[PDB]
Amino acid sequence: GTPTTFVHLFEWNWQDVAQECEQYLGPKGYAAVQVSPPNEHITGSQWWTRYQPVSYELQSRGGNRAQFIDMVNRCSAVGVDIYVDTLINHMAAGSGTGTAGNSFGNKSFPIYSPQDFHESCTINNSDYGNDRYRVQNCELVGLADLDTASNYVQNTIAAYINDLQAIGVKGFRFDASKHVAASDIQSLMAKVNGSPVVFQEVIDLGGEAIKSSEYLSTGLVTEFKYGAKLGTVFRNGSLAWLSNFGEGWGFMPSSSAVVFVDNHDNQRGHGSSILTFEDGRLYDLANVFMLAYPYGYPRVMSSYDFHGNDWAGGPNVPVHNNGNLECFASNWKCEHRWSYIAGGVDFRNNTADNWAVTNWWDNTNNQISFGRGSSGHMAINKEDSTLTATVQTDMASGQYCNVLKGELSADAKSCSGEVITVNSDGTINLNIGAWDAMAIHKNAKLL
Ligand SMILES: [Ca+2]
Ligand SMILES: [Cl-]
Ligand SMILES: [Cl-]
């Protein structure tokens, strides 16, 4: 197979990430980990402190510089890249202290002076619809707005990015990219070595002054329409409608899009329509669709139970806790380990040679099935009945692991879970319980 999917290990520290790469992400074929911001940020326990930078020293809640490097190396040894959440728009609000011991205040930081910032003003709600200048030059919730047109600012951010590349970081999330002119991002990328993966966070559901399409020339772009519409369909619509999901629904080009069911902001209600781990099996099924369907570069969300406090930081117990995995309950949720989601990743990994949707079938409502040509086939039953339709595939006849429920043995003789039969004529006689699914692919076939 080939790498197709990455994961946000939200608020995971560098030792937990490194261990997770070795024990799970490498073996299961995840391509990369998006880590929380690793630069110096304001002190305090809330998750949102990570988005208030104080400097570019690599001392953060996740760990120190040596720990960060050890993580990059341990993950890369098992084939997993690191993408860094990169704060290109701003520095912390107000005054205080950072996680490396530095002080700041009055738009004075270890590496920035007041002249390195746009003149202070406030982004007001109306500005998103009618004032691009203010969205991009004024302050987002009090954060000091860097003058991203300045050569010094561009050189300082680029030096941060290039230091990360020199220690092995392979990609970058440009936080708050809507708040930075795409032209400024273009000037920054000219100072960045090489061609790392770059994706830009731009929330654009339509109807505002700045469009996500403005950022296509400078890197990948978050397609927030994807999760918003997918959530609405899974909650209130029909899965049959998804037969032409993608550009036909008004989305950006597939080859530019980072897609996801939810992210750290919008799982806190910051779309009521967004699906999250709180939705249980409905979330499972949405992720199976996303990962089987050939649109975009998907990012699986990996969350913690925040017990109703949308500002709280993560659990005070590590993920890997002296031999106990603190997953699936009221600490870390570890969605990337949920069987249907990890199985979806394996499916995407092994269908990457055929980015077509073939033999689409539905019952006009909430039962669907489709193929990736002869590389794979899937079905979802999001109804209260058993799905027993006979569907056409392009798969070679034989017996296949349902990779949502099990894995092929090292000897290729058996599956650890359900086995699916492709008939002589390429059909499958489905037998899918209510709110269940199946996926098979050409590299999980019994020999
Ligand atoms: Ca700005
Ligand atoms: Cl450092
Ligand atoms: Cl994002």
Numbering used by the authors: 0 to 269, 272 to 448
Provide the authors' original text about this structure:
The α-amylase from the psychrophilic bacterium Pseudoalteromonas haloplanktis (AHA) is probably the most thoroughly studied cold-adapted enzyme that shows such an anomalous T-optimum, which, in this case, is about 15°C lower than the melting temperature (Tm).
To structurally evaluate our computational design, we determined the crystal structures of Chimera 4 in its apo form and in complex with the inhibitor acarbose. The electron density is weak for the two residues Ala271 and Gly272 of the remodeled β7-α7 loop, in both the apo- and holo-structures, so that their backbone conformation cannot be confidently built. There is, however, clear indication from the partial density that the loop conformation is closer to that of PPA than AHA, as intended for Chimera 4. Chimera 4, on the other hand, turns out to have a notably larger upshift of the optimum of about 6°C and now shows an activity maximum at around 45°C with this substrate, which is close to that predicted computationally. However, although Chimera 4 has lost a factor of 6 in activity at 25°C, it is now the fastest variant at 50°C, where it is three times faster than AHA and 1.4 times faster than PPA.
